[PDB]
């Protein structure tokens, strides 16, 4: 491939990131996208560092700050990008080009060049600058010269030599993963195409192909569908999706040329999109239990995030099958239609308008979010629906930590990892409305928590350390899931806590045993923490109304539930109190994140919880949430046995779902619950259908090569569906014999005959 084809190549680069061949004209919301655009450029352009030998570009952006380098580049792509968009206010000026190519002349003399060591974060000299760099050359082609795109080329290839390795000589260089080599490949991909390199553009092609290879540990995309970033971080969220976003923009480049991505194994990746992305997907926003610490960032939220998952699989459809187009197309058709809280094409790209705008013409319909049950056991995630509601785990373990902070981001997040409950609703904003710049950060809702205080970055940055627990895992039967962790405090209070989540089609058993910890201070578990908003709704109780005043602190009376308006029903499954608080709190993003403004946030909480007290001995809790319960069915949730307890202790925890037919159940040690038993850890959800026995098990520490059950419901002398190994214990019980080698935390599904 020659010159014609790199032509193409670069106009076809252009065309995806401006838009310009799919303005739809007097179309009101591709009229706002280039509003959008335009006020953006102006903004830049007030900013120019117009004084005689500057020393920056902008007059609020320093070339001695890494990440200010950063901005300053991708502030210039902005303006490239507005002055090659067809009625942006800027195109084709002349002047504004011209102060677009002084810029990037300057950048360049003063600071990015290739005689220039890195200094500080990498991810800017590598990523940052790199991606920006390369697009305002090719959105430039035309106008640069030869030796600026030399002198611009050097400048990456000194930083960039090897996009399938990342950091400075200095640092030792490492292969770069996932997210920060599809990253790496962008600008080496972009650059070749400024700069003609067939050789570069190949290589950094082939490096694609690692992204998306199944791994058993490190980084990258497991067969369970987990996707982790920095070794112990659920990730999918955030890193995956930068991973998606660059995938779907360098896979459509490419296609149809010389350098079409071609390795089969991509069918990986495109998995990947129902298989990784859709489960986490709620209504349009990625859940927060796996973008890390991205939750602390009031302008890179769930929903931005979400949004460009979106934009990328609409991208990628484009290429696909057409049932498989089509099903992508219904997917984002219903996490576009459903959000009315952060709509789409509100502040979106002129490409992201374009997108949409595609996919309402297609007439697709959209594809409701299915209810029922998904388990990411390699990132200890689980996400399970009902009508109106979407319960997101949070929990951490000997393999995921309790939570990342890095580069000032999210450093009060340390109990986001200790079983946190996170129940999506309609309520769109629950966990956006500023809800991380003034949530209690110690009594995140589900937790169980050590009062003692933590002090910012405790366990380190970048997750580099985890729990040393026994367990944490799942698994699910049909409409039921059984959800455990042993949770380890953050801190060294040496907190522990058993807690397991037993979850149906409607309501969320929550049971806790076991736990004290060794600080000498109260533990808490927290039923929930939830966002009112600037609202005031009711907690109702069986004798009237409860915390009509903030600030003080009741406790519930012995009807034993609790709605709050808008939301749904609480029931304590024990005699222990719940405490309920209604709250106001402050704060701003800037407490949170170092780069968070400093506005200051205020935001009514409901705020239920149990307290263990001091030096608790075997301390406990049970309880359940019914999201979108009506007073009217919260009040019943403990009339007729439907959820009963069977066993909550040290030993195993368990419930039946009396309607559902079904019991479920977490073992900690040998032992039985019930008429259930299990050889060592295990979590079980089992159900009698006449005279057949269904089961899923999995073995939540992923290490035991066996696991032995003795059977309920009576003996049991068949096997259906399934593997496994039938026998019968001292008592006359049935067993079943479970090679469990290598599985990973999977669910293996049994169906045994009477
Ligand atoms: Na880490």
Redesign the pocket.
Known sequence: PGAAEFAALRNRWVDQITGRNVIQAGDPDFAKAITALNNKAADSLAKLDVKKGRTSVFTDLSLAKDAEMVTTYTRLSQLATAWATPTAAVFGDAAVLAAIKAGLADANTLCYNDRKEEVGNWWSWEIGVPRALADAMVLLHAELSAAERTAYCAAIDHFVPDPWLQFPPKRGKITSVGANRVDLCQGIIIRSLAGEDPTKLNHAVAGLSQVWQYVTSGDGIFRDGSFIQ????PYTGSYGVVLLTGLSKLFSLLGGTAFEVSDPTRSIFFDAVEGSFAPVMINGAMADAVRGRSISREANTGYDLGASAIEAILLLARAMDPATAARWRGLCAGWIARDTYRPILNSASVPRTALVKQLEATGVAPVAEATGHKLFPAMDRTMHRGPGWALSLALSSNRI?WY?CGNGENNRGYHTGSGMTYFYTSDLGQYDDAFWATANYNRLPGITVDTTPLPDKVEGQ???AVPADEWSGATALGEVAAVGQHLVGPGRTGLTARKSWFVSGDVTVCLGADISTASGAKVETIVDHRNLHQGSNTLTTAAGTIAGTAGTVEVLGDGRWVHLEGFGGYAMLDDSPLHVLRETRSGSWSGVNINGSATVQQRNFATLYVNHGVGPVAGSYAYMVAPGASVDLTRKLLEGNKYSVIRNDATAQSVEFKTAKTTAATFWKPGMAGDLGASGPACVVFSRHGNELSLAVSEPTQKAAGLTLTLPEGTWSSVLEGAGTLGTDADGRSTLTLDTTGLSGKTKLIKLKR
């Open positions: 920095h070794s112990t971080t930590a990342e970048w997750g580099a």
